[PDB]
Design a protein around this ligand. Structure first.
Ligand code: A1CKH
Length: 167
């Protein structure tokens, strides 16, 4: 038993809610919150900008040190950093950004990172301003992640569309 509330069960291990991931994190304090990162960990907008703002820019400061030491992530890759005031850890996952011309085929690899964590609070990868088809991303999530994932979808109209179209 865990502390998430009001989530809709989709499969054996995936739950979904129309909510702000920052507020779900402030409430639950999950072991792992997933950020929809880019390879440079430059947290400008979307999930990343929102999470980073909620940490008072501490996420960005930590991320800049990570990049200075390790160099950029790979598209499809991830790193574990602090969750600051939002969670124990933040799993920064790079899904392909279609608006950058990146390969949507790498979405499955991005979701595979979730399998290294027993429970996660996460956004839908490559959705929103990342420019991919969100229905497709939800399909990839359910067909790839085997650990327990709680998805927080910000846009209400998107949430309603995803639920009503889910197979
Ligand atoms: O509309 C959606 O769910 C898709 C969208 N989500 C959010 O921007 C978002 N999700 C949950 N909590 C949030 N709090 C503040 C913003 C926010 C998104 C954007 C970029 C990358 C990505 O993978 C997903």
């Amino acid at each position: 038993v865990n502390s998430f509330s009001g989530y809709l069960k989709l499969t054996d291990n995936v739950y979904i809610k129309n909510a702000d991931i920052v507020e779900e994190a402030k409430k639950v304090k999950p072991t792992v919150v997933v950020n929809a990162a880019n390879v440079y960990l430059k947290h400008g907008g979307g999930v990343a900008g929102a999470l980073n703002k909620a940490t008072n820019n501490a996420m960005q400061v930590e991320s800049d040190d990570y990049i200075a030491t390790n160099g950029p992530l790979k598209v499809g890759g991830s790193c574990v950093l602090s969750g600051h005031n939002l969670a124990k850890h933040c799993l920064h996952v790079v899904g392909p950004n279609v608006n950058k011309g990146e390969d949507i085929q790498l979405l499955k690899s991005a979701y595979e990172n979730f399998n290294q964590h027993e429970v996660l609070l996460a956004p839908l990868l490559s959705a929103g301003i990342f420019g991919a088809d969100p229905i497709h991303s939800l399909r990839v999530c359910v067909d790839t992640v085997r650990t327990n994932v709680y998805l927080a979808v910000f846009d209400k109209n998107l949430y309603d569309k995803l639920v009503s179209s889910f197979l």
